Amino acid sequence: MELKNSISDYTETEFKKIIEDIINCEGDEKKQDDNLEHFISVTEHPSGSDLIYYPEGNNDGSPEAVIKEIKEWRAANGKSGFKQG
């Protein structure tokens, strides 16, 4: 029983549940590590955890700024984001 196999198998708010899970700390450290691989994995975003620990200036203010930077990185790299309804 597996997490979303891609960013585009994700939706923007399911990706929040992973991204918010960590930032809150819905976890055991290990739950947050579990995300942290996955936050590389679906995203293909090369910096991964850099967006969480060494953030931009578009970033700091909310977990939204990572969903941004996922959307933004993906679209800049010509990749699909999460779901379109």
* CATH number of the structural domain spanning residue 31: 1.10.1200.20
- Tokens representing 55 are 């953030």
Residue with the two structure tokens 């992973």:
18
User: Other CB atoms closer than 10 Å to residue 15's CB: what's the count?
Assistant: 24
Sign of CA dihedral 39, 83, 63, 2: negative
Q: Which of 2, 47, 1, 38 shows the shortest CA–CA distance to 18?
A: 38
3-state secondary structure of 48: coil
Domain count, the chain: 1
Cα–Cα distances in angstroms (integers) from residue 74 to residues 13, 30, 33, 48, 71, in the given order = 16, 27, 22, 12, 5
Per the structure, the complete domain to which residue 76 belongs is given by 1-85
Cα–Cα distance for residue pair 4/38, rounded to 1 Å: 9
Q: Which of 72, 1, 76, 4 shows the shortest CA–CA distance to 39?
A: 4
Asked if 13 and 70 touch (Cβ cutoff 8 Å), the reply is no
Start-end of H helices in 2-79:
12-24, 30-41, 50-53, 64-76
